[PDB]
Amino acid sequence: KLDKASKLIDEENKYYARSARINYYNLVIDHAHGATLVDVDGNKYIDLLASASAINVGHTHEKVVKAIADQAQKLIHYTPAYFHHVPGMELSEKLAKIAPGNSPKMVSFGNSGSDANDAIIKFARAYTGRQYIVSYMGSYHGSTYGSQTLSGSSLNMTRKIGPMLPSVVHVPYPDSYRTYPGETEHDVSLRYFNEFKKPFESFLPADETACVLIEPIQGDGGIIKAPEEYMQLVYKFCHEHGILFAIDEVNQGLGRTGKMWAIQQFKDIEPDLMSVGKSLASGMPLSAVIGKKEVMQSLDAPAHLFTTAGNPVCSAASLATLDVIEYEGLVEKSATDGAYAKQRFLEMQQRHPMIGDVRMWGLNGGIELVKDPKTKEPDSDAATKVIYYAFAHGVVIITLAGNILRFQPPLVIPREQLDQALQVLDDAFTAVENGEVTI
Amino acid sequence: GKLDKASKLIDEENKYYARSARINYYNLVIDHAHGATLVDVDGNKYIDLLASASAINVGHTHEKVVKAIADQAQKLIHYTPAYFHHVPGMELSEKLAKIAPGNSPKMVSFGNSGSDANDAIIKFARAYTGRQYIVSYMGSYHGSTYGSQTLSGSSLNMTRKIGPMLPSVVHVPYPDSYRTYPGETEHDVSLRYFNEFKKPFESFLPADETACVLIEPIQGDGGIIKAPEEYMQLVYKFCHEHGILFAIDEVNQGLGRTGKMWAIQQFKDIEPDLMSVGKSLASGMPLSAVIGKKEVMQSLDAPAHLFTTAGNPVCSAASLATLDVIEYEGLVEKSATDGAYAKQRFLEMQQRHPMIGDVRMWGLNGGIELVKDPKTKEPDSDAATKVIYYAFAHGVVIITLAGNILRFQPPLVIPREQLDQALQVLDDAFTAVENGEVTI
Amino acid sequence: KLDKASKLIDEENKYYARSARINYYNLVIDHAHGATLVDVDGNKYIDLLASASAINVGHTHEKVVKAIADQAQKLIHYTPAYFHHVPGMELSEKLAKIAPGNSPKMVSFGNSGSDANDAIIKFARAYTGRQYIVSYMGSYHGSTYGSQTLSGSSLNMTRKIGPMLPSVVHVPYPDSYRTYPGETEHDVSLRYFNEFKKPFESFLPADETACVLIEPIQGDGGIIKAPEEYMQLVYKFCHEHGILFAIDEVNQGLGRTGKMWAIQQFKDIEPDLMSVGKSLASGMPLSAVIGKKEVMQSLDAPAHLFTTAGNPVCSAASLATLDVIEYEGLVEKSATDGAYAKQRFLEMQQRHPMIGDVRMWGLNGGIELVKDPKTKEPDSDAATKVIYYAFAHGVVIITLAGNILRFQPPLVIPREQLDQALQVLDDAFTAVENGEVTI
Amino acid sequence: GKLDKASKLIDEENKYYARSARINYYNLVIDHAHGATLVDVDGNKYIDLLASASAINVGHTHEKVVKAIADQAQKLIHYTPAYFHHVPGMELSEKLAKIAPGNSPKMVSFGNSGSDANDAIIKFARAYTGRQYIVSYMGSYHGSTYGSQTLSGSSLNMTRKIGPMLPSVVHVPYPDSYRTYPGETEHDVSLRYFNEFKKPFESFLPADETACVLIEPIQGDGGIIKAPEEYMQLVYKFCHEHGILFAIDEVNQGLGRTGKMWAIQQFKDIEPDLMSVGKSLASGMPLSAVIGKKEVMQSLDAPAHLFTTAGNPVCSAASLATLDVIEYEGLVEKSATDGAYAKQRFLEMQQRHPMIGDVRMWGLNGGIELVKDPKTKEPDSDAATKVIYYAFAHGVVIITLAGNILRFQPPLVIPREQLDQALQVLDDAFTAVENGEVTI
Numbered sequence A, C: 001k002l003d004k005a006s007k008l009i010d011e012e013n014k015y016y017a018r019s020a021r022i023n024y025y026n027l028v029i030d031h032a033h034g035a036t037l038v039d040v041d042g043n044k045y046i047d048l049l050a051s052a053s054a055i056n057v058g059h060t061h062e063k064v065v066k067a068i069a070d071q072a073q074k075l076i077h078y079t080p081a082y083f084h085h086v087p088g089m090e091l092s093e094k095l096a097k098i099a100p101g102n103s104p105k106m107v108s109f110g111n112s113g114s115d116a117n118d119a120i121i122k123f124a125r126a127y128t129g130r131q132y133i134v135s136y137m138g139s140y141h142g143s144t145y146g147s148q149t150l151s152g153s154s155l156n157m158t159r160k161i162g163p164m165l166p167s168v169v170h171v172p173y174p175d176s177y178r179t180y181p182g183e184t185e186h187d188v189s190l191r192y193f194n195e196f197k198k199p200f201e202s203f204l205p206a207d208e209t210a211c212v213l214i215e216p217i218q219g220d221g222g223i224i225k226a227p228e229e230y231m232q233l234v235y236k237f238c239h240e241h242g243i244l245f246a247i248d249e250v251n252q253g254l255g256r257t258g259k260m261w262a263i264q265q266f267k268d269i270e271p272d273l274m275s276v277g278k279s280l281a282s283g284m285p286l287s288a289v290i291g292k293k294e295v296m297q298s299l300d301a302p303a304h305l306f307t308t309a310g311n312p313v314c315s316a317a318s319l320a321t322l323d324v325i326e327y328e329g330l331v332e333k334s335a336t337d338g339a340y341a342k343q344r345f346l347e348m349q350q351r352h353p354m355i356g357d358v359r360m361w362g363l364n365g366g367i368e369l370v371k372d373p374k375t376k377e378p379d380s381d382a383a384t385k386v387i388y389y390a391f392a393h394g395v396v397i398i399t400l401a402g403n404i405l406r407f408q409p410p411l412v413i414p415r416e417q418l419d420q421a422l423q424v425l426d427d428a429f430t431a432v433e434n435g436e437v438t439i
Numbered sequence B, D: 001g002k003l004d005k006a007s008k009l010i011d012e013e014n015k016y017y018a019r020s021a022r023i024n025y026y027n028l029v030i031d032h033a034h035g036a037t038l039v040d041v042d043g044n045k046y047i048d049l050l051a052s053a054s055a056i057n058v059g060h061t062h063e064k065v066v067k068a069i070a071d072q073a074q075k076l077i078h079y080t081p082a083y084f085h086h087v088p089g090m091e092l093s094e095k096l097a098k099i100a101p102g103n104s105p106k107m108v109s110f111g112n113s114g115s116d117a118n119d120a121i122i123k124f125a126r127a128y129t130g131r132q133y134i135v136s137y138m139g140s141y142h143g144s145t146y147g148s149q150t151l152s153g154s155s156l157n158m159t160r161k162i163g164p165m166l167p168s169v170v171h172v173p174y175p176d177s178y179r180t181y182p183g184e185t186e187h188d189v190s191l192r193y194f195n196e197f198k199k200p201f202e203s204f205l206p207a208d209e210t211a212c213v214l215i216e217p218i219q220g221d222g223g224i225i226k227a228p229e230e231y232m233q234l235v236y237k238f239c240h241e242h243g244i245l246f247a248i249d250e251v252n253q254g255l256g257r258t259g260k261m262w263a264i265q266q267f268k269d270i271e272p273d274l275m276s277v278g279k280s281l282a283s284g285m286p287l288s289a290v291i292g293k294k295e296v297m298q299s300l301d302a303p304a305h306l307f308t309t310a311g312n313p314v315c316s317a318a319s320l321a322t323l324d325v326i327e328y329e330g331l332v333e334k335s336a337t338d339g340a341y342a343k344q345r346f347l348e349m350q351q352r353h354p355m356i357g358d359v360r361m362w363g364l365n366g367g368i369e370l371v372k373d374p375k376t377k378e379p380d381s382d383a384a385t386k387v388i389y390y391a392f393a394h395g396v397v398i399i400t401l402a403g404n405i406l407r408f409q410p411p412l413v414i415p416r417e418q419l420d421q422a423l424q425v426l427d428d429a430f431t432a433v434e435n436g437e438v439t440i
């Protein structure tokens, strides 16, 4: 079942540092296609992680596979940091326009979402001439010294490595589930906007805040969407004070949320800056920061550039990846399957009381499990047990914040495989309730 | 116009793509390449003396690399090593552990770029030592991420308008063997620079609170300068006697570029606690790695250092094929031989062309420093611009460092006939510039 | 009436930086005694400010004046950084014992409360080996880069002078007066302790937090005392995580609150570190950091010291100051006149509904003005009128946060003077209601 | 008998007073003092050569200052200028703004210590220029507050255990004119050190982002080291050309200590943008001030920089008197005259005592650097210790700088008789060390 896989993981742990991996189970993938993973042992699973929302278009999509192998024969690499290639020129043009909004934009290439967010700090700082950056608790923007300082979802991203980047203030992200009693969405929006302002009313000058970076829906936080009114308040606040408005679309973008972009789950908001990564190259190492033209011109070279960034083989794969999304109606597909998945999960909650909250926007959801529906006490054990039952039954799914099931399969997932996956979870809950799982 | 398409395409790209993301030289829209041969969209062929900033050690589109890229992609394009495992990456992390310089057990951590690798060095060093301070050199380049960019010291536009930078970082002067004082021997240089090295430790920087010294055995972007043997030994000793980790940046000078596997092996008996790799690691595919002594790498918990796409299975395959080409075609030796060849050729050119003030070369990695007057050693950026622009017009691509130093880093697999063409174009370029035939 | 006063200030304003003063009145003091001020024109005023709670024992106190004169003849100054003098040895020993708690304590001198709070950062980091400091929004700790970074009461303390000291996190301070509908003190305490945790649950590791600095009662914030329950939750949390618990007694200490130390207004709380300043030497430049011996021995010379710090003249003045507090029973006097003062103001509140909130502990209080009781909207206009009517009727009083009247007279103030001052304040409110005062 | 009472008071103070707040030399428990005379609790007399870190330029307990203190204490012990005004402070701030070097209008701002004055400099420079980076020197001491301590560079214990320190700060070497390279002239020294000064600016530090350069015209803590005239001129010019404010620390070397009113007046026509004053300003009473060109001092709104006790009416009275005494007694001139004499006394000594490697002196303000051998210049801290204890046992109080440098900064009023007494004792000390007659 996992024999060949375990023998190898045990040799990788001698040579590969434990800091670079979050460990759940022994999974040594041989190959995969669409939403199906096959390990070296021959076990087939249904993928509900999509490699951390990096494979919206499914594993080894033939169009993407072909682009890669085609481009590799011509030019594996020549750095855009010095010269020019057709795939990159084409892709920067396309990203500049498909980004939300109608203001002219420019693009800057990276290898990872992390460096894209580092870029955001740069551009924001150089454009405004201000130094302070506001980010959110519960957020995750990367592992580079800039984007890690912004993050607030793991204490291990601060431990033993400080001091971090100076001039960063964190604020709390609106939690609509663990609220005070009798609190409407409007009250939640107003409460969290009060917290948002307190720093600006005490030690943090609004005139010296370069920007505010926010995930329209916090991924690592537990698929938490900020209330519509809250986003508007913060948005208005930024433009009223010269503070750039930046979004992290690294995880929640490219159709994940049932719209091209997660910020498009909101009314008429265009970001000054935004980070795109992961799925852009179907898992290949490509990222980008997109921004209003005037902001992207604020820096002179080489303020922000990487040798391997905007790799032609990777740019080709992103060009195919985007054609796949538009041509297979993946954005629209996600909104639909996300609505059907929500229904089945809301129905599961009528039978399984442990499922405290069902958050879902497109094929993008968080299934928050608790010990009691009225106390909302996190249940890491129920959640932990559910996934293992899933793994042993051909479904790969993980957790966020211990007790929340992370549901983010490839957007191209066939309906047959979704019902097949949604069933195994239905069983997992019963299996857990009837005390049948002991990890 | 030889560049009729290239110019038209760049005019559009400059509207959508930030200008800070590229150091502009020539209108070069590459269509395809192989070995040390590049072909633009207009059909013009060039000899590659830049190797995409030493990211193409084994030459463009090597069939083994191309094949590994195509084979691996079909089976699995990606699945993050930050959560799960794939065979190509398990194998590469093992190989990079043993081929790393020194004999101490080592562990590897993958990244995407040279920049994030050095960012990791800071963390691992800080985490292991329990100290916060980091020492790096002026004239260095470690990356474009907030950590590595703070360590760098080669471009004022890497500090400008993005401050404040990362705290607890101190810069020291890197030993310069060309612009020295009258009568200074190598021993004098080593001592003078080691003495500047100490000053901060003798004043405000506690040696006991310094997590590590990061250094380029040969500064690349700094103008291809090699630290004198004795200097490196003084520094290396000082670190050990004080519990400071000794880290090296091998992102540019590594993988057979200097004529050995690692630039550090040009120095006697030195094993680093931490080292950064990238670029040529996967023939230009985005893949880096930090490699350090086992006990250091273990000093951090997850997810202190990971990237979704770092250790990409396609890039891992690419890298294994790359490392195989270096071994099988004996590229390390070839660099040492053709390097030695290039060096003499350039030293002979210097005898006829006094604008060439200094010839620095180790493997097929060289800096040809151009100066107005050999006695004053005053930099001649205008001349070096002329040489390179003449070369471009004559089918040879080559850029500069620090304005006046010609950058010599072609793919290690370059055929002797093409190495000789390029050298002749360069020679011709020098004569052409002397006669005032080249206009910038 | 302000002739000589105004002519002198015009001449001063060409030479003294405007940032070195917050301007109220053309008040040039020639001399003073007890709670009576006398300007260079002959006008008399009752002091309700006490040089910012720096004159607890009253102006030109016989004991304190004589002490200063006698010491200046024997030795104006010798630095304790290098050599010893008797007045300093007695002071450092005495303070070490009159500090709250019975754990053994050591003392280190400074010149102002600012540098003492800078010391607290040093000693905390040193002892714990941790780098992160947690301070409060709405706090004021000093004008030195360390203490200024910890501060949170004026955006002008951050502007144009950054970057600030790294590894500092700001948490909100419990606000009893402006709460949400139907909140009890218990809800306030739990809410604010809930905000306090968020950072430790996201990006701030408790295990890497050296300390938490807090004012038992925020002075600059507006005489805001934190709920007993809150404090205990914080204090307990600190001990469970190895986080030192620091207090800033610079403003609210030395009997100001009706007990020796503002921290003693809470139950069984001994700080690991405490800053003292202001009134310790009757306004002479002298401060101190007092901590548990094990904490203070964590530093080697000269990590923290000052040339003029622990000055023999300012040490003598302090010894005499502490003698007055003890001999004249000023701690008890403050508790009593404070209890009395509070009831008088509570009584003024019932008759004057522009008094939104009456915060008082000992002879120190904030009298917050509002436009409407239900809204609790700040009424800066009214407050400014009151303080100008006051000055015009021989009473010197300033505001905190624009709308809060700062009631902090010398502890030795005579009941008659106190009553006359209170009566003028009563008249002021009545006058402002009748529309009789415009500046 | 001699220090028995002092050893019991000190044994008890060590239980309550932190060891970090004092540099321990001797069991000197002072009862009173006047001029350059110190008297312990046992009635022992000592000649003061430390002037309590040069905070007693006008001698201990000057009668005019004492009267100033007592008279004022009776009128008003304190009322903060942060909120209100008092005549003594208004007079002082006016006078400081005029006696400051240069003819450009100035504005003052009061603090309590040299430290907060230096933190203020950072603020003012950053606020005026809009730039963040500050440049200070190694071997410098500017204070114990987090800002000024970060600029400081004279002690490792001022950084240990307390970081991270204030960001955006770079340290540069100070010109050493004693431990030079063989054959170096003042010119050579000046150019070498100016060249080191530029390396950061030529590598990672953007000059257009450097708010200022803070410097001690003569380093006090460093060992009484004066920068060469030419060097200072070059740095001065560099600052003006790039908009970088030029700040000086006059806390230790100001108020007539060097033979001129300001240490910077030892150089030709150099007016600072910002400067810091303290110590002697108020004859030891806690008062400091930052002084700068008006336009610079107007770049902050309140309360960016203020202290409750800062500008205390008694301290200002003390300061006003101390300034009249300097003037009335011609102390500036006396520092130069008696400084020139003391310098010769020490040079005559150096002729018979070759352990005296260097005699640095400017006013009654010197550093007598003691070495093991004149050729090698190896520091002899052992000898220094012995000399200072021998001096202490024979009624002369004096301490060292950097372990091997004797610190010479008595009260400027020192009577010639006492000066010769002390001098003769230090001579006796050298002879005594020579003969191994002194054991610590």
Ligand SMILES: CC[C@H](C)[C@H](NCc1c(COP(=O)(O)O)cnc(C)c1O)C(=O)O
Pocket: A022, A051, A052, A053, A112, A113, A114, A115, A140, A141, A142, A143, A215, A219, A220, A248, A249, A250, A251, A252, A277, A278, B082, B303, B306, B307, B308, B309
């Ligand atoms: C442990 C979290 C893992 C690494 C991962 N974090 C992704 C992430 C990144 C990181 O971009 P890289 O990692 O591509 O540089 C940036 N921004 C957001 C919003 C992200 O969500 C995840 O969410 O699964």
Ligand SMILES: CC[C@H](C)[C@H](NCc1c(COP(=O)(O)O)cnc(C)c1O)C(=O)O
Pocket: A079, A081, A302, A305, A306, A307, A308, B053, B113, B114, B115, B116, B141, B142, B143, B144, B216, B220, B221, B249, B251, B252, B253, B278, B279
């Ligand atoms: C202008 C910088 C250019 C592209 C490039 N320098 C890249 C570089 C990097 C960053 O590696 P990335 O860029 O993969 O993160 C890291 N370390 C060294 C020594 C490097 O030399 C050069 O040498 O031309």
Ligand SMILES: CC[C@H](C)[C@H](NCc1c(COP(=O)(O)O)cnc(C)c1O)C(=O)O
Pocket: C081, C302, C305, C306, C307, C308, D053, D054, D113, D114, D115, D116, D141, D142, D143, D144, D216, D220, D221, D249, D250, D251, D252, D253, D278, D279
């Ligand atoms: C150990 C050095 C001792 C304390 C002392 N240092 C004083 C000093 C200060 C500190 O000013 P404070 O101490 O008034 O804040 C600031 N600037 C210079 C040039 C100084 O020289 C000395 O000179 O002996």
Ligand SMILES: CC[C@H](C)[C@H](NCc1c(COP(=O)(O)O)cnc(C)c1O)C(=O)O
Pocket: C052, C112, C113, C114, C115, C140, C141, C142, C143, C215, C219, C220, C248, C249, C250, C251, C252, C277, C278, D082, D303, D306, D307, D308, D309
């Ligand atoms: C604007 C606040 C003014 C100046 C003043 N603040 C004093 C203060 C200080 C400053 O101590 P210093 O300045 O002696 O170093 C430190 N800590 C607390 C709690 C303080 O309250 C006040 O309370 O009116």
